[PDB]
Coordinates of C-alpha atoms and ligand atoms in Angstrom, one line a residue:
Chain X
X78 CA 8.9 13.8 21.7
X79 CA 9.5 14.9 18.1
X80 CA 6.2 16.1 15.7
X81 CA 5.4 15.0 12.2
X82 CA 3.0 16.1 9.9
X83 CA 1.2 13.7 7.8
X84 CA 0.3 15.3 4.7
X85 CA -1.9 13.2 2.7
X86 CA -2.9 15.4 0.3
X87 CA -3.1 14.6 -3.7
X88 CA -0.9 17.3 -5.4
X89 CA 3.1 17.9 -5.0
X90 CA 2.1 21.7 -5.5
X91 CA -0.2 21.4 -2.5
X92 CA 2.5 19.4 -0.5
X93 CA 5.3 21.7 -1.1
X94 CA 3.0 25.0 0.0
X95 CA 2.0 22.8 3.1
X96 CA 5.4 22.0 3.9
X97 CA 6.7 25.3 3.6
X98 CA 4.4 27.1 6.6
X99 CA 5.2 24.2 8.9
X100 CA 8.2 23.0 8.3
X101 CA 9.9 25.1 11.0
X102 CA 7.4 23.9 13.2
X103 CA 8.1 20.1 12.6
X104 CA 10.8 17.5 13.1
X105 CA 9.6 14.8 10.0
X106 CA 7.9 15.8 7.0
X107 CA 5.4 12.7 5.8
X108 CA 4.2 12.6 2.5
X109 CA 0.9 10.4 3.0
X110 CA -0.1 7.3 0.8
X111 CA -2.4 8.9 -1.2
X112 CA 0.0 11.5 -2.1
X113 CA 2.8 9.1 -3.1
X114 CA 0.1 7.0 -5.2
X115 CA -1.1 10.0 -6.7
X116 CA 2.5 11.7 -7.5
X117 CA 4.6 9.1 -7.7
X118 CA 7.9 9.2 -5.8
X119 CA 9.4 12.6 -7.4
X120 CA 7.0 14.0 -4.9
X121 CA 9.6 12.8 -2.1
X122 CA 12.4 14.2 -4.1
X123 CA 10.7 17.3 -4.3
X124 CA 10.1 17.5 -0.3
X125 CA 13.2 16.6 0.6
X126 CA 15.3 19.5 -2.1
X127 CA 13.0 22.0 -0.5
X128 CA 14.2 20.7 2.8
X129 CA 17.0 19.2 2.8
X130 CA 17.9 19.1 6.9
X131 CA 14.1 18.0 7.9
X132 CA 13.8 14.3 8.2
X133 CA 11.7 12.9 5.4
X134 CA 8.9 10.2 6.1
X135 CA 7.7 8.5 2.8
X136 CA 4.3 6.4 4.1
X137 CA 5.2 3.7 1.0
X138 CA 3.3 1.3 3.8
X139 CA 4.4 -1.2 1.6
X140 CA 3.0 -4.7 1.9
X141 CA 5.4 -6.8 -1.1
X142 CA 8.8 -6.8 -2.5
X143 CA 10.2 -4.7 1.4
X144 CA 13.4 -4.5 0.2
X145 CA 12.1 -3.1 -3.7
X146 CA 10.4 -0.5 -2.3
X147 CA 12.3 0.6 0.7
X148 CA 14.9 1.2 -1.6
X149 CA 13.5 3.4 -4.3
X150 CA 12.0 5.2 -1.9
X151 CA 15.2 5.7 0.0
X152 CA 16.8 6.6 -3.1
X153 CA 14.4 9.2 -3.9
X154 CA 15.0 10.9 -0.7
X155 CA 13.7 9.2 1.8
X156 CA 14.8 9.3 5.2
X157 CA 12.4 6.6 6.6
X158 CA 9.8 4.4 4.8
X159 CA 6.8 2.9 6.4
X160 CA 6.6 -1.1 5.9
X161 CA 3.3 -2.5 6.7
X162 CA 2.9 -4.7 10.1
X163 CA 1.0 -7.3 8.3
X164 CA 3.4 -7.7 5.4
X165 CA 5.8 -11.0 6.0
X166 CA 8.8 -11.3 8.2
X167 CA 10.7 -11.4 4.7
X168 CA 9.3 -8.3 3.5
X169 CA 9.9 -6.6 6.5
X170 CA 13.5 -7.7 6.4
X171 CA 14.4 -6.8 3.2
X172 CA 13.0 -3.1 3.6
X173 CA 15.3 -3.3 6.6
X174 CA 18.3 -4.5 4.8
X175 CA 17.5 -1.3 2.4
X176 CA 17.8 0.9 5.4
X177 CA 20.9 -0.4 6.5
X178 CA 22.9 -0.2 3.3
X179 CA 21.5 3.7 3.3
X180 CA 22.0 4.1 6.9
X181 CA 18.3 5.0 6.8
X182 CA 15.4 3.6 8.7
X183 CA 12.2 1.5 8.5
X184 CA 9.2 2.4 10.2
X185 CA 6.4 -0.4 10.6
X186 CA 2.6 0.7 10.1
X187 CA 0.8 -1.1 12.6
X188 CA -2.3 -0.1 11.1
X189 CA -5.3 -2.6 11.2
X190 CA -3.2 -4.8 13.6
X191 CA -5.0 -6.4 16.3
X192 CA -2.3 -7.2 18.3
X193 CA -0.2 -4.5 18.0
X194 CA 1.7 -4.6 21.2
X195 CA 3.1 -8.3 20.3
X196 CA 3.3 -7.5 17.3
X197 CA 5.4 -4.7 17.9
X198 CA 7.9 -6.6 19.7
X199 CA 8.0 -9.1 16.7
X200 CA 9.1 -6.1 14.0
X201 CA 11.4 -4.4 16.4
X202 CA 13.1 -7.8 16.3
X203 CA 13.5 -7.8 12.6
X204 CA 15.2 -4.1 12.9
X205 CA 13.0 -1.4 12.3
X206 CA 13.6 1.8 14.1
X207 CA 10.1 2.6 15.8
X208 CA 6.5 0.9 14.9
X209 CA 3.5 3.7 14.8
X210 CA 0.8 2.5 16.6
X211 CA -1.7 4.1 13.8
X212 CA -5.4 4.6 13.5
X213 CA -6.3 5.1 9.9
X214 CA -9.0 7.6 8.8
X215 CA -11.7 5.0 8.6
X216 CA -11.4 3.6 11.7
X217 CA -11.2 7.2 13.4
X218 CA -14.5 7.7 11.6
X219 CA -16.3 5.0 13.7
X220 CA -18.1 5.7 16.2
X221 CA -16.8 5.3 19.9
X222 CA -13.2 5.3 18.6
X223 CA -10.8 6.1 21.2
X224 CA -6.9 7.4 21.2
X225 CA -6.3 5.6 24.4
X226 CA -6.3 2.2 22.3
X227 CA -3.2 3.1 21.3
X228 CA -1.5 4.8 23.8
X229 CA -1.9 1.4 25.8
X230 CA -0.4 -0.7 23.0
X231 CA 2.3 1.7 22.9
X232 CA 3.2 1.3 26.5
X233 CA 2.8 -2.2 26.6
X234 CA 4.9 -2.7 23.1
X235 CA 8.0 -0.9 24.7
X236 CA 9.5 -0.3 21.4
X237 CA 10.3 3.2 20.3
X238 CA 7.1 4.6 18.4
X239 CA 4.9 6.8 17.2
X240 CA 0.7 8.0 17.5
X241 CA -1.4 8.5 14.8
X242 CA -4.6 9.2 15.3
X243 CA -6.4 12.1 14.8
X244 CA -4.0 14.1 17.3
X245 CA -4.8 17.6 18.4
X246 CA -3.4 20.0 20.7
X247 CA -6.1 18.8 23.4
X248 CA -4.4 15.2 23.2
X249 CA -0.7 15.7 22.7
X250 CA 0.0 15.4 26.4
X251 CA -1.7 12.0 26.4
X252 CA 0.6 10.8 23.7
X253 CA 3.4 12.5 25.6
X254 CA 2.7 10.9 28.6
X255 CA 2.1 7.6 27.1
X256 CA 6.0 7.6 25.8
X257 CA 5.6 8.1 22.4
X258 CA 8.4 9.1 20.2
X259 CA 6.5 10.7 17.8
X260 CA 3.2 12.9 17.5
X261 CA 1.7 12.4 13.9
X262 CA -0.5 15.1 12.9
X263 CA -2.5 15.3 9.9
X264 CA -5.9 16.3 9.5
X265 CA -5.4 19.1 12.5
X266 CA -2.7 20.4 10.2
X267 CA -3.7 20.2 6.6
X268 CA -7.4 20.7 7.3
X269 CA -6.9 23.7 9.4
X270 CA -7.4 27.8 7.6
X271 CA -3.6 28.5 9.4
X272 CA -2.0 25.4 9.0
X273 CA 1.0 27.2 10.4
X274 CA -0.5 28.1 13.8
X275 CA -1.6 24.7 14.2
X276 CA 1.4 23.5 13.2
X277 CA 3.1 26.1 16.1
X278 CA 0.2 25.2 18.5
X279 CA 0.7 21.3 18.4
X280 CA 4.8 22.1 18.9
X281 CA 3.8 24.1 21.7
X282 CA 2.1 21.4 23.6
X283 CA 5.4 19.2 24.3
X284 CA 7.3 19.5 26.7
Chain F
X154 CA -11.3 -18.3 -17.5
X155 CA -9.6 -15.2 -18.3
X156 CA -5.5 -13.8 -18.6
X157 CA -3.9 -10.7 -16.7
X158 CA -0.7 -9.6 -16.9
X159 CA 0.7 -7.8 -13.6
X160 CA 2.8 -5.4 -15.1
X161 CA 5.6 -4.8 -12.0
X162 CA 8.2 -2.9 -13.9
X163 CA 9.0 0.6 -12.5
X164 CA 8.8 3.2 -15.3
X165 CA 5.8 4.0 -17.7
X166 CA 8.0 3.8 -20.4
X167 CA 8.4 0.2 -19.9
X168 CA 5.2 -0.3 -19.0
X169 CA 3.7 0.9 -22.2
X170 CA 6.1 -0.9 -24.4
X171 CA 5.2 -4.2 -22.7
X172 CA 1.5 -3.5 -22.9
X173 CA 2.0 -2.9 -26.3
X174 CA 3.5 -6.3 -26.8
X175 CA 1.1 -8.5 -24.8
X176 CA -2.0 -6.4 -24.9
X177 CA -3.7 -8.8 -27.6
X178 CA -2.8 -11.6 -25.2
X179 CA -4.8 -10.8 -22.0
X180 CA -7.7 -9.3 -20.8
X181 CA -6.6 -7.3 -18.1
X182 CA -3.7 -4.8 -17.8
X183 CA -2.6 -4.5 -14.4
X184 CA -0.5 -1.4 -12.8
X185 CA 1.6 -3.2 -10.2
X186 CA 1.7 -1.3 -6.8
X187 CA 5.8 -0.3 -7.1
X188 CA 4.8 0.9 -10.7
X189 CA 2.1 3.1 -9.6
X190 CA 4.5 4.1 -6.4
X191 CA 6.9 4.9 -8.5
X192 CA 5.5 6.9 -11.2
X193 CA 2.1 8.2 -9.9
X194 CA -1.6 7.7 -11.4
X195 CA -0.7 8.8 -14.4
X196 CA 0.9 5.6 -15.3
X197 CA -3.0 4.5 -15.3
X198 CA -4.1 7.0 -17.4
X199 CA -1.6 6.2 -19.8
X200 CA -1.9 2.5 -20.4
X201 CA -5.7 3.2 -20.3
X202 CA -5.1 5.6 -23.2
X203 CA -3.1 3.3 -25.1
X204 CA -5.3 0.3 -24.2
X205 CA -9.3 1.8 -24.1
X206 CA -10.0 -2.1 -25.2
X207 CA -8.6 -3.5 -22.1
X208 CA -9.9 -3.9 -18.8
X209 CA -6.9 -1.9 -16.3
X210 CA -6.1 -3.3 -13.0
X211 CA -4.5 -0.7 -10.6
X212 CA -3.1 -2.5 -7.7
X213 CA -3.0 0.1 -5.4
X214 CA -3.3 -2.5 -2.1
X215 CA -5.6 0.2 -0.6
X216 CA -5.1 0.2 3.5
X217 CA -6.7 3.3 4.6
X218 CA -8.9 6.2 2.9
X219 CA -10.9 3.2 0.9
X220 CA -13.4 5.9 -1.0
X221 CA -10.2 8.3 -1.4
X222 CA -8.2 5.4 -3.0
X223 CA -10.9 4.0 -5.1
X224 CA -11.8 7.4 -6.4
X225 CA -9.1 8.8 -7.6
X226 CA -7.6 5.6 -8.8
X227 CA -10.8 5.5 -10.9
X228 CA -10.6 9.0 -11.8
X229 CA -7.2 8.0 -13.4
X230 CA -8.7 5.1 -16.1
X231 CA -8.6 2.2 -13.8
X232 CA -11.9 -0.2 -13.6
X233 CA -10.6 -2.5 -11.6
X234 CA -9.3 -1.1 -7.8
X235 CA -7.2 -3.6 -5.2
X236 CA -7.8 -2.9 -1.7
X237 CA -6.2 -5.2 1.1
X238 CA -8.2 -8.0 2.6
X239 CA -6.2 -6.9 6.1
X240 CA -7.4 -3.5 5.8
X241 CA -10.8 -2.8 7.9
X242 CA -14.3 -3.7 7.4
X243 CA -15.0 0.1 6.9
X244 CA -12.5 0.8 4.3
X245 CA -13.1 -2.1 1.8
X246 CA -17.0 -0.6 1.8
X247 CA -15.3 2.6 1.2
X248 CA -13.7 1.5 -2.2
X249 CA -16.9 -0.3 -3.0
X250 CA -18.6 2.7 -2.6
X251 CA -16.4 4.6 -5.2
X252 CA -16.9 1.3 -7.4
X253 CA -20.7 1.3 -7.6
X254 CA -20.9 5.3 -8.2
X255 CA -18.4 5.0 -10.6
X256 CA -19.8 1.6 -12.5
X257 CA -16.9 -0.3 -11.7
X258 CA -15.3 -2.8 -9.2
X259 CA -13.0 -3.6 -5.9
X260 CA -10.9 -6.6 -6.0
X261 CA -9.9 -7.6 -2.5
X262 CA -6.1 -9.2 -2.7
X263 CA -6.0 -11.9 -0.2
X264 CA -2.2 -11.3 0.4
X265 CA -0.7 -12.7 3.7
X266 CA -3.6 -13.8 5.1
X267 CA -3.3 -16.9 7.1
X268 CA -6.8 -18.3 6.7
X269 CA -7.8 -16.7 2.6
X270 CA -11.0 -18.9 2.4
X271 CA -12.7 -17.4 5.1
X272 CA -11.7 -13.5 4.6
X273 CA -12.6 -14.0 0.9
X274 CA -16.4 -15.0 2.1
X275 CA -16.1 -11.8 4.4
X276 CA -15.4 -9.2 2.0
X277 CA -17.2 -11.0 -1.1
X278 CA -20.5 -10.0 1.7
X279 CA -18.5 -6.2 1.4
X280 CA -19.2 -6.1 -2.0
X281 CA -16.0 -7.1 -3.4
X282 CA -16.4 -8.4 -7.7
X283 CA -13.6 -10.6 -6.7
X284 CA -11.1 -12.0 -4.5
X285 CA -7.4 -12.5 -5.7
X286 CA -6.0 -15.6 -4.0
X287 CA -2.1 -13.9 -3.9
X288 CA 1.1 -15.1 -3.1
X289 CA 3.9 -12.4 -3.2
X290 CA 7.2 -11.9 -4.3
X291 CA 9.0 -11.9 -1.0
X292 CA 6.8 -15.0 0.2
X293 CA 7.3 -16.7 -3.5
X294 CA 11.0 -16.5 -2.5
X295 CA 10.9 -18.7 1.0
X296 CA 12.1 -22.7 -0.6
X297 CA 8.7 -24.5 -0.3
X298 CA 6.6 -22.6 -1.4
X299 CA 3.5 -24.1 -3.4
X300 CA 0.7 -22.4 -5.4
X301 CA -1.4 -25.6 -4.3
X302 CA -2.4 -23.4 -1.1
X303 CA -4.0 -20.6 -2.9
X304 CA -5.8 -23.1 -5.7
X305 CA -7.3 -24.8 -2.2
X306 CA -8.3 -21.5 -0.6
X307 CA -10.0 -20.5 -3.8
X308 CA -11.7 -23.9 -4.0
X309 CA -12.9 -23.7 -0.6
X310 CA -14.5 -20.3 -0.2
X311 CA -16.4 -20.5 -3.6
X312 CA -16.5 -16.7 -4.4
X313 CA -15.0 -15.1 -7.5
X314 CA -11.8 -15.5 -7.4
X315 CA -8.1 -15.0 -9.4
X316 CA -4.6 -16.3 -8.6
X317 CA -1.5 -14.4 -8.8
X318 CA 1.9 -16.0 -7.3
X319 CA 4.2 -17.5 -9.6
X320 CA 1.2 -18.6 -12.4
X321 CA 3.4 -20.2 -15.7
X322 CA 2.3 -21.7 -18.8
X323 CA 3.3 -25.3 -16.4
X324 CA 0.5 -24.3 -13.7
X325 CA -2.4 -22.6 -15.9
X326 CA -4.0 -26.2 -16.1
X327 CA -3.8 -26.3 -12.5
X328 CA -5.3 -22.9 -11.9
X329 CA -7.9 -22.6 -14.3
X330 CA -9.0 -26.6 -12.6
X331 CA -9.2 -24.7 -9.5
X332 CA -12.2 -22.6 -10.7
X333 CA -9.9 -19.6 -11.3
X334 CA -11.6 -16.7 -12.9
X335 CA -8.4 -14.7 -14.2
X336 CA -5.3 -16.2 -13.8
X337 CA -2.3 -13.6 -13.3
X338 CA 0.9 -14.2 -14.8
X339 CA 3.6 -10.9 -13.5
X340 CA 7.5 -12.2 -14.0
X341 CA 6.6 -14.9 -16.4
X342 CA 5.9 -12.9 -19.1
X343 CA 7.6 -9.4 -18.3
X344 CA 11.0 -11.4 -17.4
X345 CA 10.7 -13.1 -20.0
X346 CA 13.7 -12.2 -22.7
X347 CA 10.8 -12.2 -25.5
X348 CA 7.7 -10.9 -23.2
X349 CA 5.4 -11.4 -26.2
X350 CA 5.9 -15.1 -26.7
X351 CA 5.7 -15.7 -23.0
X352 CA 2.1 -13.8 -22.5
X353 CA 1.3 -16.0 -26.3
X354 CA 2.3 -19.1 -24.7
X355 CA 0.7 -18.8 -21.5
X356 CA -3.0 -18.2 -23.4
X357 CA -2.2 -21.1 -25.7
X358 CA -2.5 -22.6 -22.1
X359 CA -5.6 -21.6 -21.1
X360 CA -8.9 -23.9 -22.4
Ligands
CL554 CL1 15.6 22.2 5.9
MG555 MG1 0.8 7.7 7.8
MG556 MG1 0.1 -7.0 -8.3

């Protein structure tokens, strides 16, 4: 199992010091949503100079025009792109066809999805790489939420994918265990005081 | 009923020099969501800058971090916020949360829903101004495809609402029949060769 770090921050100055004391720690650097909305994508191009063998995740979680923005985001240095599960078939295909003309890869967001087992099998058909079976912030916020939501669509979706969710050291072995592909940090990272020892703490926990 | 043009072009260059062609044409500017991916917030700024008199749109299709997205979207010069009718409960209160500290207002685009007459009643009881009634480009693109759907959808859940998917100077009748409140007109007037005939022709339209 490979870790990323989501960092959905606002500022490429902020994203570049972040990515600098984990990066050694990490397998895919994420630049979050908000960061991308906030920067634009020479925040991607930025990531990727400074780290040019680290595989770079641009959460675009694009919902129109798949192919459009796959691409631009490819070209700017992305090495995957987030599509979201609830866009069309169509978009979702496009953003694929993008990632096969780069020899990149889609990844499909399956946040807010109900039915994110089926739909999991439904993406993986139209090519994408892995789905990440994703709790957004708001949703972690409610009470009662629970990780194990998601871990269970996981292993019922046998696709490749990944957990976001408000991960911590305490539940990488769950996601581990569950199959996942990827642990997605965020919060545990950028909202730690050493963001490098959580970074090296979370690594530590895999097997 | 009023005119918006959804600016989809991907550099604030262009952006600006179409505003400045249609601007005395519309009411509302929008910042198409690959524009704002591409160059950042301060594509928003700018056009707010160059257009105080004009209401500004930023489409940012908000799934996750409603308050976050909202907030610094406003911070940026936008009144008007999108946030997805397919993203949760909790983050479409988020954004109007942001809205009504910051005097302004969440539009929830309707995009790729199924059943758009009843989610616009849902999230017009969130607080939403306004519901688009959207078709996009990818789904514009599928032979078949009718604007008729959206008109209905609007009709039917009687809440504020605007169209956007494929409006032309043929259609505005149609629309603004519907009960539309803005119509939005995107590749009809900036592909147009001459975009400032196109947005004048498509008010001539409007009664
Ligand atoms: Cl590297
Ligand atoms: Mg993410
Ligand atoms: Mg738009």
């Amino acid at each position: 199992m490979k870790l990323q770090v989501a960092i959905d921050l606002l500022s490429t100055e902020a994203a570049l010091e972040l990515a600098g004391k984990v990066a050694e720690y990490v397998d895919i650097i994420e630049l979050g949503t908000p960061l991308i909305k906030a920067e634009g994508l020479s925040v991607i191009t930025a990531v990727k100079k400074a780290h040019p063998d680290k595989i770079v995740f641009a959460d675009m979680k694009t919902m129109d025009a798949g192919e459009l923005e796959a691409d631009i985001a490819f070209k700017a240095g992305a090495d995957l792109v987030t599509v979201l599960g609830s866009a069309d078939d169509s978009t979702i295909a496009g953003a694929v066809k993008a990632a096969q003309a780069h020899n990149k890869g889609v990844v499909v967001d399956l946040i807010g999805i109900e039915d994110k087992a089926t739909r999991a099998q439904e993406v993986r058909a139209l090519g994408a790489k892995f789905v990440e079976m994703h709790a957004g912030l708001d949703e972690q916020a409610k009470p009662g939420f629970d990780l194990n939501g998601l871990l269970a669509a996981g292993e019922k979706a046998r696709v490749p994918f990944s957990v976001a969710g408000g991960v911590k050291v305490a539940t990488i072995p769950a996601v581990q265990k569950a199959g996942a592909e990827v642990a997605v940090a965020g919060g545990a990272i950028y909202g730690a005081a050493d963001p490098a020892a959580a970074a090296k703490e979370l690594r530590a926990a895999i097997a």
